[PDB]
């Protein structure tokens, strides 16, 4: 089958090597698996030494971590928007490592509301559609939460605009074809500005 040896190549002087031996059990290769967004589907494969690997054919969710605070919540991925290697990967919407995606921001907004007693990215005040208040059952909570707000600080203006729409950009940092998991982190700061600057022009 597919071979990954260097025998069939050409020497650095340009000379052509001659036949040495037939293909070996090692040095083999395998058919690439193109991950796509859809209902979960994973196959098991028996690799060298009796171990196993996990081929992911269709995935829809994975862990993504928010950097500064350090909390990670499981949510779903909407779609891929950029890929440094090939554009056709983007158009076919297939996801691999170093793929820029868009993720749901709901679990992170909820956790932020629980940790800090203030709302983040709410420009729906024009509509006043979902205004609701629940009585908060304590008074030590305001001093602890306001202590957190006065100590840690406030979010940069760029991230609330993302939170109002409810979509966040992320980068896959796992290898879906190898480990069968799509994992990443929410990207922000100057590296974020790099991607918005490149994304629309």
């Amino acid at each position: 089958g597919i071979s990954r040896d260097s025998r069939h190549k050409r020497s650095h002087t340009g000379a052509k090597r001659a036949f040495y031996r037939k293909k070996r059990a090692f040095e083999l290769g395998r058919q690439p698996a193109n991950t796509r967004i859809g209902p979960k589907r994973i196959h098991i494969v028996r690799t060298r030494g009796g171990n196993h690997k996990y081929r992911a054919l269709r995935l829809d969710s994975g862990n993504f971590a928010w950097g500064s605070e350090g909390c990670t919540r499981k949510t779903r991925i909407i779609g891929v928007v950029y890929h440094p290697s090939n554009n056709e990967l983007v158009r076919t919407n297939t996801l691999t490592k170093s793929a820029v995606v868009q993720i749901d921001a709901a679990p992170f907004r909820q956790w932020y509301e629980a940790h800090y007693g203030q709302p983040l990215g709410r420009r729906r005040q024009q509509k006043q559609g979902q205004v609701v208040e629940e009585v908060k059952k304590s008074k030590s909570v305001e001093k602890k939460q306001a202590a957190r707000f006065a100590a840690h600080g406030k979010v940069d203006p760029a991230l609330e605009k993302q939170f109002e729409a409810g979509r966040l950009y992320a980068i896959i940092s796992s290898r879906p074809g190898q480990s069968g998991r799509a994992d990443g982190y929410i990207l922000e700061g100057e590296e974020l500005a790099f991607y918005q600057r490149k994304l629309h022009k």
Binding site: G67, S68, P84, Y195
Partner: protein
């Protein structure tokens, strides 16, 4: 080396596992701990160049600010080609002994090595290289020091 800009590529270049966007600012002496540039020392009495510590270039093959370890032989030579990108060719000369005729003849070999942006290498120079893991089809050495010109 001479590089106009650091980020001039399709993807974003950054050192792995170096966290760069932290809300709280803490000043520490450690190179990689605080969130600033990371670097190490190869050893064998080789001193880290000054340009590396404050430079902004990103390279994953430099022995400094990179993910490559140096182990094996250490060799020296004369550069013969440095006109491609981030790689040079050195020329090594030696003497082979023919037993029957009781005298020598000259022979030579060609070697390929990876050059870091920290150094500036011109033609006809002495360099010292060290063995490393396979970095390409025919590149297995890295430059460590450039000897002064005559």
């Amino acid at each position: 080396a001479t590089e106009l800009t650091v980020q001039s590529e399709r993807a974003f270049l950054k050192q792995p596992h170096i966290f760069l966007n932290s809300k709280v600012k803490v000043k520490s002496t450690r190179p990689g701990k605080g969130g600033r540039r990371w670097y190490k020392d190869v050893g064998l009495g080789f001193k880290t160049p000054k340009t590396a510590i404050e430079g902004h270039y990103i390279d994953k093959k430099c022995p400094f600010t990179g993910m490559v370890s140096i182990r094996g032989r250490i060799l020296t030579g004369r550069v013969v080609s440095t006109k491609m990108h981030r790689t040079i060719i050195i020329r090594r000369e030696y003497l082979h002994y023919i037993p029957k005729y009781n005298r020598y003849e000259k022979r030579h070999k060609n070697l390929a090595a990876h050059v870091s942006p920290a150094f500036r290498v011109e033609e006809g120079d002495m360099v010292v290289v060290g063995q490393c893991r396979p970095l390409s089809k025919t590149v297995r050495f890295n430059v460590l020091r450039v000897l002064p010109r005559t």
